């Protein structure tokens, strides 16, 4: 869970200048760090960030010695991110005129990690190096660095302005590749990112993540067969974990505010009635029948809790998707560390899959939960297999509405040309590509990989308000609109079919 | 279909209605009263805004607007309630029969023309809009006027007039010692004379069984959740209606009553500052949120502006193969999309073309959905839905589009990694046998909500002052005994073949 990140940057003059046609590398690094810190602040994962810079006239390190380990300042030690850090990076971070070797920067970062790590359970440690590799490399202590890094289990990542470079930059890239190969080997070549690539990924706030509670029960078929199972929630409509707090417009405090409820009778005198003399009731047609809460509990429907029973087995065709109810989808696995339960559940899943059948079951979360009737159907993948449970309707929840038929309606019978235009439209706006080599469908517009725009908007507005207290809210970011819209190719291809459809179909607003 | 259903219960009060052919059997009057009470209870539960009335003919007393003779209007057209059921409950037995005879009287003459006139007059008094008008005639006399031909002609003329006005007449014939012959007189009065309803009936009509079948589920009339605009492009727009064919049924909300007289009490919530103690309008407060050891303050209007993305409607995005859709990606109950020609003319043709070609090409229309204002967009897939009819030509699957909500990345969750242990073919075969033994046919209306049914039973018992509440049979409970009988030794063989000798699943 916890993770300590030591961002080691540089402020050397070598980045203060660059080609005017592109943004300076220093600006790119600043933007990357700002985006990362924003994500950490608005994703409360309890991770910690420390900030070190090498290439500044100041000298503040735990280890000084002689000329070595100089020109390096530990700007910010290891604590939880806060808006003060964002302000610091906004102004305090300033360029410089001196150079330095990124090896010493790595040494000081490792020293800071080692010194401050004790006392906390930080299970992961990442150090990110932002350097242009313009300065010379004092390769004289590589072996000890590698030994220490492997002993301490510390990960290292690099960020460069390039994915037409000077020979010194080439030498820097070579030494970096050597270090990464020593640390991890081949895969390390994928841990060196560029500024454009990093800015691509860090433009979206971290998605709201919650942990599902493991729900144990026993799947029963009859009165003698039982399989120990654990259920988790796979799909649910996510909501913000924090809610707005009403505050007083002047003192800006919630302690000076509180709500009250007043009950009164149906009379001109407007008599006041206390909460200890209000009974519960219902309306039975044209009258009202008292029904106290105590008697309601006495006469309530009482059921044994935590039931997962198999009412029966039905063909998959008889259970249709349009009838699914509820607000959640459950994934049912065998109980953890139980081989017998795993074998039993695998047998049931495979049997149902082979016979093309699903299990109609009864579900009750606990004693206080209303009973439910649902469908459990098999889900077999190349690595994992399980049951998937979704609720099914009752008699009272079904609505019998009658609608006129359009196929045999003389008034609204389409012609051949209209149908051809619609066919052309459907073929032009295809959102899936059929690769013939693999004969496979590729999704051009995957909706399940788009973060909820609502949380993006909320966090953007909150951040803008925190950093600009007196200012109107901004508009929706362009990239949000881009990720809620289809790729430009689909829009480009669909213009002519749409014009044809407009021509053939008369539509008159009324 | 707009308005309310109006129903009038005509009950004969002649002598022949108060005699029991067998010792252990119900008199026609008792059967009629039971049916009336059952319909009253069904209406209270299902449609509480409908109008019901109860009239008697053949009595000695009279009570009507026209001051006719031998016609007692017991209850004029009004919404159902417990008081009326209790009022009818005093004629439910032999002592109730004596009470009815004392209060009103029986065994007198009558004219069907006057009875139908009183029923029509009752219909006229209603000031609401009535979608249906119905009269049910509970009688066991097939020839009410055999001696007088003029009365028969008057009754025929009045029945014809009532039919012209738009009043349905139904005959619920009860058991007669000699048998009931509709052929004699009631053919002309009845609204519809079925071909099979011509032979002499020696037993009460089959409609009484349906009347006594209590309906305890709310029946909601057709209604559109929203009328939206489907926008294929900035210029091509059609009008659609969104409906919900599946909606969760909830208990009616409780009301707060005063204990000393059972009169409703109204509630009001207000917020006042601690120091001054005065009321604070909603305009004198702000909103706050803590993040990164800081307090962020926003006004309410901005808080609502945070949610504004696009105007209400459906925006087309493209078309997707139906294979890419997944069944385990369920997020929210699906909706129904149908054309609507009231707002835009020509929508039906384009909708039909899209439906036909989507069915032919097996594709679903991907769209961005914003139901109301100030609601962030969701992604929906419109899956074509063809028209499917059952044997009796009653439509069971309407034509249109099924709107299915697709999840965002935040709506899914990560599962703990679990090693897979596959089953050998023998275990799968034994479990296949077990599955095949417990096969059954499933229908969407094969189960009832135990909680709601018990709630309605309890409410009825409390209202009508019954001895004990009726207990509902829970069909969701497994039939353990039958399953054990059917499976036989399969369970033991499977347990031997899949579980070690010392496993103890319970522990």
């Amino acid at each position: 869970n916890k993770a300590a990140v030591v961002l080691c940057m540089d402020v050397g003059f070598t980045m203060s200048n660059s080609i005017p046609g592109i943004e300076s590398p220093f600006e790119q690094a600043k933007k990357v760090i700002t985006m990362f810190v924003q994500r950490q602040v608005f994703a409360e994962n309890k991770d910690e960030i420390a900030l070190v810079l090498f290439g500044t006239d100041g000298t503040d390190n735990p280890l000084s010695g002689g000329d070595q380990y100089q020109n390096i300042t530990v700007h910010r030690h290891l604590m939880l991110p806060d808006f003060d850090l964002l302000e610091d990076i906004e102004s305090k971070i300033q360029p410089g005129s001196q150079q330095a070797d990124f090896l010493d920067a790595l040494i000081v970062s490792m020293d800071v990690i080692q010194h401050e790590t004790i006392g906390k359970k930080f299970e992961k440690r990442h150090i990110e190096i932002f350097t242009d590799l313009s300065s010379r490399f004092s390769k004289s202590q590589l072996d000890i660095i590698i030994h220490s890094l492997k002993k301490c289990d510390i990960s290292l990542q690099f960020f460069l302005p390039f994915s037409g470079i000077t020979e010194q930059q080439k030498e820097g890239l070579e030494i970096v590749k050597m270090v990464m190969i020593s640390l991890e080997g081949e895969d390390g070549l994928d841990e060196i990112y560029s500024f454009s690539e990093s800015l691509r990924k860090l433009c979206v706030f971290k998605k709201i993540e919650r942990h599902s509670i493991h729900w144990p029960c026993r799947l029963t078929i009859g009165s003698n067969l039982s399989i120990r199972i654990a259920a988790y929630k796979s799909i649910l409509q996510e909501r913000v974990k924090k809610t707005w707090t009403v505050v007083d417009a002047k003192t800006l405090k919630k302690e000076d505010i509180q709500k009250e409820t007043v009950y009164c009778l149906n009379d001109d005198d407007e008599t006041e009635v206390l909460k200890e003399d209000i009974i519960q009731g219902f309306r039975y047609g044209s009258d009202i029948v008292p029904f106290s809460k105590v008697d309601e509990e006495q006469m309530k429907y009482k059921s044994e809790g935590k039931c997962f029973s198999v009412l029966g087995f039905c063909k998959s065709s008889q259970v249709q998707r349009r009838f699914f109810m509820g607000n959640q989808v459950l994934k049912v696995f065998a109980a953890r560390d139980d081989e017998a339960a795993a074998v039993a559940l695998s047998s049931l899943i495979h049997a149902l899959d082979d016979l093309d059948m699903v299990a109609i079951v009864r579900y009750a979360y606990d004693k206080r939960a209303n009973p439910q009737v649902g469908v459990a159907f098999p889900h077999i993948k190349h690595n994992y297999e399980c049951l998937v449970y979704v609720q099914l309707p009752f008699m009272e929840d079904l609505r019998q509405y009658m609608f006129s038929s359009l196929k045999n309606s003389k008034k609204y019978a389409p012609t051949e040309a209209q149908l051809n235009a619609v066919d052309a439209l459907i073929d032009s706006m295809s959102l899936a590509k059929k690769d013939e080599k693999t004969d496979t469908l590729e999704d051009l517009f995957p909706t399940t990989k788009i973060p909820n725009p609502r949380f993006q908007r909320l966090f953007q507005c909150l951040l803008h308000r925190a950093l600009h207290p007196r200012e109107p809210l901004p508009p929706i970011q362009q990239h949000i609109w881009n990720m809620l819209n289809p790729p430009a190719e689909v829009t480009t291809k669909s213009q002519i079919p749409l014009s044809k459809i407009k021509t053939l179909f008369p539509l008159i607003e009324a | 279909y707009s308005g309310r259903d109006s129903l009038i219960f005509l009950v004969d009060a002649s002598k022949a209605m108060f005699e029991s052919q067998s010792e252990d059997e119900l008199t026609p009057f008792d059967m009629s009263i039971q049916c009336i009470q059952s319909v009253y209870i069904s209406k209270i539960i299902s449609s509480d805004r409908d109008l019901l009335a109860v009239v008697f003919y053949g009595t000695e007393k009279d009570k009507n607007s026209v001051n006719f003779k031998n016609i007692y209007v017991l209850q004029e057209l009004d919404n159902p309630g417990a008081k009326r059921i209790l009022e009818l409950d005093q004629f439910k037995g032999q002592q109730g029969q004596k009470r009815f005879q004392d209060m009103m009287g029986h065994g007198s003459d009558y004219s069907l023309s006057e009875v139908l006139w009183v029923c029509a007059n009752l219909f006229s008094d209603v000031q609401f809009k009535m979608s249906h008008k119905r009269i049910m005639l509970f009688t066991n006399e097939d020839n009410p006027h055999g001696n007088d031909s003029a009365k028969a002609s008057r009754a025929r003329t009045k029945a014809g007039d009532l039919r012209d006005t738009g009043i349905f007449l139904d005959l619920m014939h009860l058991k007669k010692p000699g048998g009931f012959d509709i052929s004699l007189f009631y053919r002309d009065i009845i609204s519809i004379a079925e071909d099979e309803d011509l032979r002499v009936h020696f037993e009460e009509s089959s409609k009484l069984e349906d009347l006594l079948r209590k309906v305890r589920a709310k029946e909601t009339r057709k209604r559109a959740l929203s009328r939206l605009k489907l926008k294929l492009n900035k210029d091509i727009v059609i009008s659609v209606g969104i409906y919900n064919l599946v909606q969760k049924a909830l208990k009616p909300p409780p009301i707060k009553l005063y204990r000393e007289t059972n009169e409703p009490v109204k509630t009001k919530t207000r917020t006042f500052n601690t120091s001054t103690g005065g009321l604070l309008l909603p305009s004198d407060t702000k909103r706050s949120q803590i993040y990164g050891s800081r307090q962020i303050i926003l006004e309410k209007e901005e808080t609502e502006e945070l949610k504004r993305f696009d105007d209400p409607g459906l925006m087309l995005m493209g078309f997707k193969p139906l294979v890419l859709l997944k069944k385990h990606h369920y997020l929210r109950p699906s909706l129904f999309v149908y054309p609507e020609e009231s707002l835009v003319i020509g929508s039906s043709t384009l909708f039909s073309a899209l439906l036909i070609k989507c069915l032919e090409k097996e594709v679903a229309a991907l769209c961005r959905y914003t139901p109301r204002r100030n609601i962030p967009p969701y992604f929906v897939a419109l899956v074509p839905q063809e028209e499917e009819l059952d044997d009796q030509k009653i439509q069971v699957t309407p034509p249109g589009f099924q709107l299915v909500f697709l999840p965002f990345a935040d709506d899914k969750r990560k599962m703990p990694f679990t090693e897979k242990i596959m089953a050998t073919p023998e275990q799968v075969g034994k479990m296949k046998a077990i599955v095949e033994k417990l096969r059954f046919t499933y229908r969407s209306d094969s189960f009832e909500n135990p909680v709601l049914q018990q709630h309605f039973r309890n409410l009825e018992a409390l209202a009508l002052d019954l001895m004990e509440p009726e207990q509902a049979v829970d069909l969701t409970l497994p039939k353990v005994e039958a399953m054990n009988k059917r499976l036989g030794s399969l369970v033991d063989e499977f347990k031997e073949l899949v579980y070690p000798p010392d496993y103890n699943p319970e522990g």
Binding site: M395 | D5, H132, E219, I394, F440, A482
Partner: peptide, 23 residues
């Protein structure tokens, strides 16, 4: 028209809930 409700006109007479009826 066929199989219409005698209590609520305009609605089809729902068949009673049958639960599980094994074949």
């Amino acid at each position: 028209c066929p199989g219409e409700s005698l209590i609520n006109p305009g609605f089809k007479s729902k068949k009673p809930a049958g639960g599980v009826d094994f074949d």
